Amino acid sequence: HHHHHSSGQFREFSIETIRNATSGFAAENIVSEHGERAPNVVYKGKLENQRRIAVKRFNRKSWPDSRQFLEEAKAVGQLRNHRMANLLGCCYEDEERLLIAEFMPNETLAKHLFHWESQPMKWAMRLRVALHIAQALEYCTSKGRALYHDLNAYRVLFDDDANPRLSCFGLMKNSRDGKSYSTNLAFTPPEYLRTGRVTPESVIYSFGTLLLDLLSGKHIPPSHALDLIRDRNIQMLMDSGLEGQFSSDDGTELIRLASRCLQYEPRERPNPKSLVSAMIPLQKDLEIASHQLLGVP
Numbered sequence: 001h002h003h004h005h006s007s008g009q010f011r012e013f014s015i016e017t018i019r020n021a022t023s024g025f026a027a028e029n030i031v032s033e034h035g036e037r038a039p040n041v042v043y044k045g046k047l048e049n050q051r052r053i054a055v056k057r058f059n060r061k062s063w064p065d066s067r068q069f070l071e072e073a074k075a076v077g078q079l080r081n082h083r084m085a086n087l088l089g090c091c092y093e094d095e096e097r098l099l100i101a102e103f104m105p106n107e108t109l110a111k112h113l114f115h116w117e118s119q120p121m122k123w124a125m126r127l128r129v130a131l132h133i134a135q136a137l138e139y140c141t142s143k144g145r146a147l148y149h150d151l152n153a154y155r156v157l158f159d160d161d162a163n164p165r166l167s168c169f170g171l172m173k174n175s176r177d178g179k180s181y182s183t184n185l186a187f188t189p190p191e192y193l194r195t196g197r198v199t200p201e202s203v204i205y206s207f208g209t210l211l212l213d214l215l216s217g218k219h220i221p222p223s224h225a226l227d228l229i230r231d232r233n234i235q236m237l238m239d240s241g242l243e244g245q246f247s248s249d250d251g252t253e254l255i256r257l258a259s260r261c262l263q264y265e266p267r268e269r270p271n272p273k274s275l276v277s278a279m280i281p282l283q284k285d286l287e288i289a290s291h292q293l294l295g296v297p
């Protein structure tokens, strides 16, 4: 009952295996947004042993040299941690360039925060998300993957137990020669648009934007949020759907953490160890299981 035991070692899959598992990349199995119009596409799959997988399918042009693709995929595939949707393998046969990860069946932070079905996300879950993602980043950095290419709400996934995890796919670029941030520039770190180079300090700024998303319940430009915080207009910032779930004090403390993350100078931002340390004491409702908190099983 696969989510019981360890992920198992990184391996190379055949294209027949992956075609069989995804019903030949059936559009019905697309789990990413925008169907086949997106520059890459993620499919749900199921292996013959019933293990569920996520298959990221790239255009050959993104990763034309399979040797480079495999090398990168293998390095990411060494990482194994319960805060990650871990990378199980890759496939580079028949002109395909595929990454294979643990399937996370409860969608994304984007879905449950911005596009919720039952109920808005509970404060305690928002905090659990921030902790788990901080622990994921600390893990990744400890294993020599300190870059993460566009940390945002779509990278946060919910596992079989409805626990938040970080996508392994963002540990690699969307193409060999591409940009590390392909999303709206108003959300990117200030030095990024100067240099076009992702550093570990970039990821921390992006964690800050994740915090702002969690605080506000919407995808707020950081300059707008920072104006509100500067002017002490917190009631304009905070999600009105959180009313009565949090102290002014613990809300304050999370905004303080966001402010550090979002510092203009990269050397002033916290590191992942420090994010973990700041998030631990903020945790609430430890006794409520994630499936109950999220509103799933």
Ligand SMILES: Nc1ncnc2c1ncn2[C@@H]1O[C@H](COP(=O)(O)OP(=O)(O)NP(=O)(O)O)[C@@H](O)[C@H]1O
Pocket: 031, 032, 033, 040, 041, 042, 053, 054, 056, 085, 101, 102, 103, 104, 105, 107, 108, 154, 155, 157, 167, 169, 170, 173, 174, 182
């Ligand atoms: N392990 C996973 N299990 C289930 N669904 C996943 C998994 N990984 C990614 N997804 C889904 O696929 C979406 C797209 O993932 P992905 O293509 O890796 O990133 P992206 O936000 O499109 N950025 P990019 O890396 O530029 O392609 C996520 O937002 C999830 O909806």
Ligand SMILES: [Mg+2]
Pocket: 032, 038, 040, 041
């Ligand atoms: Mg994509």
